Every structure is written in structure tokens, then in C-alpha cells.
Amino acid sequence: CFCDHYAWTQWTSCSKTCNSGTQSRHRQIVVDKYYQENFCEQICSKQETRECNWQRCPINC
Ligand SMILES: *[C@@H]1O[C@@H](C)[C@@H](O)[C@@H](O[C@@H]2O[C@H](CO)[C@@H](O)[C@H](O)[C@H]2O)[C@@H]1O
Numbered sequence: 001c002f003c004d005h006y007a008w009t010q011w012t013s014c015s016k017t018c019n020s021g022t023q024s025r026h027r028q029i030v031v032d033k034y035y036q037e038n039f040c041e042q043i044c045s046k047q048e049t050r051e052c053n054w055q056r057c058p059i060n061c
């Protein structure tokens with residue numbers, strides 16, 4: 001199975017604008033002949049969540 005046959009969406013915009021939140025992207029899966037036959041379901045990545053707007057949030061006086 002070539003999982004890149006099913007394209008990544010774009011990464012989402014960040015859950016926060018600082019103090020570090022998360023964001024995600026997922027393959028655009030369609031459950032066809034190729035998917036069921038080549039066991040893409042067992043070995044292919046479906047989700048990613050991660051660090052975005054990482055820096056410590058600034059604090060004003
Ligand atoms: C997003 O952009 C940055 C430039 C900051 O100005 C952020 O301010 C912070 O906003 C968060 C919202 O999650 C508040 O919790 C913070 O108190 C505030 O400093 C801005 O939201």
C-alpha cells in the first residue's frame with residue numbers, strides 16, 4: 001500500500017495564538033478496491049495533532 005495515494009488535507013489553524021495549542025491534518029480516505037485489498041487500513045496514518053503558537057504568551061504590565 002502507498003498511503004500517499006490518499007492526500008493530506010492542509011494543517012488546521014492553531015487552537016491558541018500563544019501558550020502553545022495544537023493543530024491537525026488527516027488523509028482524505030476513500031474506502032475503494034485499492035484500500036480494502038492492499039490492507040491500507042492496517043498500516044496508513046489517519047491523523048496528526050501538534051504544537052502550534054508555541055512561544056510563552058507575552059504578559060503586559
Ligand atoms: C493571539 O495573538 C498573540 C499576538 C497574542 O496577542 C494573544 O493574546 C493572548 O490571547 C490568549 C487567547 O488564547 C489569551 O489567553 C492571553 O491572555 C492573551 O495574552 C492573541 O490571542
Ligand SMILES: *[C@H]1O[C@H](CO)[C@@H](O)[C@H](O)[C@@H]1O
Pocket residue numbers: 004007008
Ligand atoms: C501529506 O504529506 C506527506 C509528506 O509527509 C505526503 O507524502 C502526502 O502526499 C501528503 O501531502
Ligand SMILES: *[C@H]1O[C@H](CO)[C@@H](O)[C@H](O)[C@@H]1O
Pocket residue numbers: 009010011025
Ligand atoms: C501543514 O503545514 C505546514 C506548515 O507548517 C505545511 O508546510 C504543510 O504543507 C501542511 O500544509
